[model samples]
Target: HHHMLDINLFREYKGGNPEIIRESQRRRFADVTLVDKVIELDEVWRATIGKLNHIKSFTGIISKEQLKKLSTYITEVHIKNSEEEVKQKEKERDDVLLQIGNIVHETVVVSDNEDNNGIVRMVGNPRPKVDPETGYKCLKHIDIMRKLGGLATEEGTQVGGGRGYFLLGDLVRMNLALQNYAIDFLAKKGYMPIYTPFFMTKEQMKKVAQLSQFDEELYTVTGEGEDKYLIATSEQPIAAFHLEKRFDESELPIKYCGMSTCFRKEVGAHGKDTLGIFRVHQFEKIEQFVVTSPKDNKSWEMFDEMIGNSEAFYQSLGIPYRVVNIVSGALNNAAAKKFDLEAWFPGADEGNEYRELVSCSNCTDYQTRRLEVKYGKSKKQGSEVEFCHMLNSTLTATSRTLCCIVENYQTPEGVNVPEVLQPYMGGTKFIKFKN
Candidate 1:
């Protein structure tokens, strides 16, 4: 059901050094034998094809009656066995390659522990650990939301199921303001605005996501012919936007600001963050997606651009954050390297001080190879078609960012709105409690 890796590219790596892939699997603490298995299968498949071709040539020399018997034997035994071996071995080889993770970038720290993730840089001054007005630690976001009369829990759960809640009154407005601000921010930077379909087919999902790995996190809708999965993020649709497209070098870097209402089962996150909307079943988000030529050449540059935009967005909002170079063990299969922007929440329950707000990854050719997105350096009739690099990062997930803002901007009475978002919220400064 999955697409095979580009054989030419895989062969080039095997020719130069398969050890790079071996070491990558080792770093991920995954199956190292998969690489060896692919190479062995390739060898057997090639040898069988050569033998099959040689057997076919013998038909030209033998007499008619003898040739008839020989041809029958060849089709019944030799060709049948050879053909089955060729097809089976090819399938086995590609399946193993799909299991292998992308080669890790040298900049990533080789560690199995997620806590050991390298801190790239911390931005903005964190809010005072204690409340400036009361000289006490601030309350958790759920507490602040309830205190401000903006959250509905029992009623919401009874109607919508687990990890579901209602954002009443000002909270709803706050979430919408966040969406508008984020879209305007990226729109000025040449990211074309896009509203993508919230549901995608299994075929489209496989190209951009590792379905089996994240199956529990996905919500599948089964009705008609092909089952469609509710998109967990805008990244899925944006990445598949250029499926089978070939662009010239001049059309190298294409950027999109994707907005979507995301749905997830969150089955893997059992018993975690169940108190509020910080982790929820449905939410709205703004995503940053880019397509670039030359595979590895400009993907990192676009990675930096995408992350910088998120950083600046938070900085403008006075949300203290730190950029983390996600550890090797925490990376998904498509990412050569990843960065996560964790926002500081002064009121977090002791160990949960920093929560992830944005995730940035440079998936150089890993996704394009599957999606069949390519580019040519020249517009000439016959130029080399090379895989393009695709990168995706979150600009703002309103639910999490809203949680951060409420905690950090909380005062003795209510949560304070960021100045930039105030105009969008009709110049309201505070979400104060009222009877």
Candidate 2:
């Protein structure tokens, strides 16, 4: 990312005056001095090896001729200066660290208030009313999920530790149905389907995501001599897969629908909705990703299409929902703009309340530059490229979407399958337990 910064300003300004040049030179020297410290250490290690070789050769027990053939070692002056360079570099690094800590403290000390976040349009219908008699006008997703035999806490917790549940029976079939449904939809729209690797080197993963310090949220794997990390999302690997590759202008907009099992160690729900498969450690997903020219204004258009696909999928299931422009504070660090589609949960504890089922984000060029994905106008200009703009949307988050389906489609008789899924389920209209 820093490679894109133009240093011509520093160079042009430095040539104007002697004092200015000296100041620029001093700053440049400081940067070079830090690097020199590393090089000096390497040089010293090589020198020490040469000296040891010489000593061994000169013993006569070895040979004087061999000693003469040994390479020269670092001079006394080089050794002294290298040691001083190391000390200076360390002191400078320490000072920078202190300054950074002070700045962070000041930034985080500010208070948060509702006024700080202006409201965007509210999505979906208002909350449902309470039942006066039984006081159970609505059932939580957990209740509906359990009644349908979709919750499997014992098996999940046994193998996956805490907050892990496997989708069972109809729910498992429905999960795959949703994935296939979304992929087929994207394919008709000219999107190529891809399945990406679910793990990457830590360094590569960190380049596209800003989660370096959040070790608890990240899963790392290290072996005797290998290092890698389980991917939190397919986004990182897909985004970086085409890194350093130049694409043709005709392929200006490359759309991909990726299917993968996402792993999230830090799902943010405290005890609420914990009994069911609403939230889990692992879940299947169909993610939409796009790469286009950085100069294109059609990213917003593409963003709309991404959201449209999500909403259409839910609507096909006869579910009512609303699309919301997410507030800035609600967006991830990588998202420049985001929108969410929240589906009405008819069986929610409060029936009319909605839950987030999918999100569409326009990341612009933020991730592309970090991943080094680029495109060019012509073959000749291929080597001289510009970062492509990136956009992503959750085509389907199977687990949460399944929760919505159970709530919205449940009836007094049993769980009614949506009209669209009926054909997929072999003409079955409702799912019920065997007697």
Candidate 3:
């Protein structure tokens, strides 16, 4: 396994910028003294290493009688204990460093309440609460699928337990169609499709995710020599792909669309949403990932491009959505700023509500520093190697978006397939059950 590299955040902290880090922590409602704790641990480690060096230096100049007397001064126990102390302190410092989150961007809404999230824009018109053709109340996605004989939750429970379901017949075809449609859509926009491994080592995951805090959301598979974790998103594996590589400055931006079947434990989620396929143990996702230069505002521009792609995608499907600027306290540790595309679900219990369909984030150098992915020229040539910025967005997650489509596109005939995806469905316009 590759060792974790020193991150840029620590370099900045050690360079006497504790206030910047402290302010960021305060904004996140996280502990601010962790910055002080890491610094103190680092000081102790330096002193411990110096003590060991002093003990070893005694061997260089000593008379025979002095050497005999001084042998006890640097015995096996003394050297061993000192070396152990240095190692322990080093780990302690790094562990504390790991707890500090990424610095917040200036534009993020500095509030604890999610309701304070800024709305960027809303698109399209939401469907009516009641179906006009049928002259009856529109039903939830699960109920519609149940009546159409396209969902089997009871049998799924027997097979895989709670939050499990079998997508029978048409629902199966629709899921596959959505996957192909999204892949084809992104391929046209310069995102190379990469089908990735569904499992990641704990070491790799640590670099890409907030493993210390997000551990409960992962599914660990053991019995192998080393434990393997099922990935919660394709973003995890894709972000770790170029682990310790360096790129030329000219190759400023690299784009990829990662394809994978994600597995999540979802230990934190429960109730109504979890009752449907919306929050499930496993699902398919096509993720948008980019690696770009650390230059000013380059990452910011890429952020818009990624989110815009998602916006155009939903627009083509005629799904009403709103783009939201996520509040600071609600952001994950990796993101400097985040935006979410929430699709309007008309048949929900609240009659009409927007549910998250995509999450786009500019992680800046936070991920690349941990992965040691650098770009630019060698220092000998008068340029310093800098960590690259990493960003990720969800293009589509078949299950949740499928639920949105089922809820919003229903009619007396059946659930209408989005026009953009109808070609993938062999020109089928609507999904109906033959009773």
| Candidate with the greatest TM-score versus the true structure | 1
Q: What are the TM-scores, per candidate, against the unseen true structure? A: 0.92, 0.69, 0.87
Clashing pairs in 1: none
Candidate 1 lDDT, tens digit per residue, 1-435?
A: 112234443454444456677788888878889878877877887888898788766655543322478777877788788888889888888887888988888788899899999999999888877857778888788888988888898788998999778888999999999999999999999999999888889889988888563567788888877888889999898888888888876897999999999998888888988888899989999999888875445787788888999999999999999999998988989998899999998988778798899999988889888887877745464534567888899999998899999999988778899999999999999889653
Q: Which runs of model 1 end up more than 4 angstroms from their true locations? A: 1-14, 60-77, 132-134, 377-385
Question: lDDT per prediction?
Answer: 0.84, 0.63, 0.83
Which prediction has more favorable lDDT, 1 or 2? 1
- Residue 161 of model 1: what lDDT? 92
Model 2 agreement with the true structure over 1-435: per-residue lDDT tens digits: 111111111133343222332232232222324323333444455465555555544444433333433323332344445556656654554433221100001111121232332333343443343445645455566677677787778887887888777667887777777788888888998889999887788778876777632464557668744677777667778888878666666777889998898876654545656666666767888888888765646666787788888777776777677766654334444565667777777665534376677778877666675676766645565544566778888888888888877776665445788778776677778887332
Clash count list over all predictions = 0, 0, 0
What tens-digit string does per-residue lDDT give for candidate 3 at 222-322? 89779888888988988899899887769869999889999987777656475568878889998899999877678889999999999999999899999
Q: Which of 2 and 3 is the better model by TM-score?
A: 3
Model 3 earns a TM-score of: 0.87
Which segments of model 2 are wrong by more than 4 Å?
A: 1-136, 212-216, 223-225, 267-273, 349-352, 377-385, 433-435
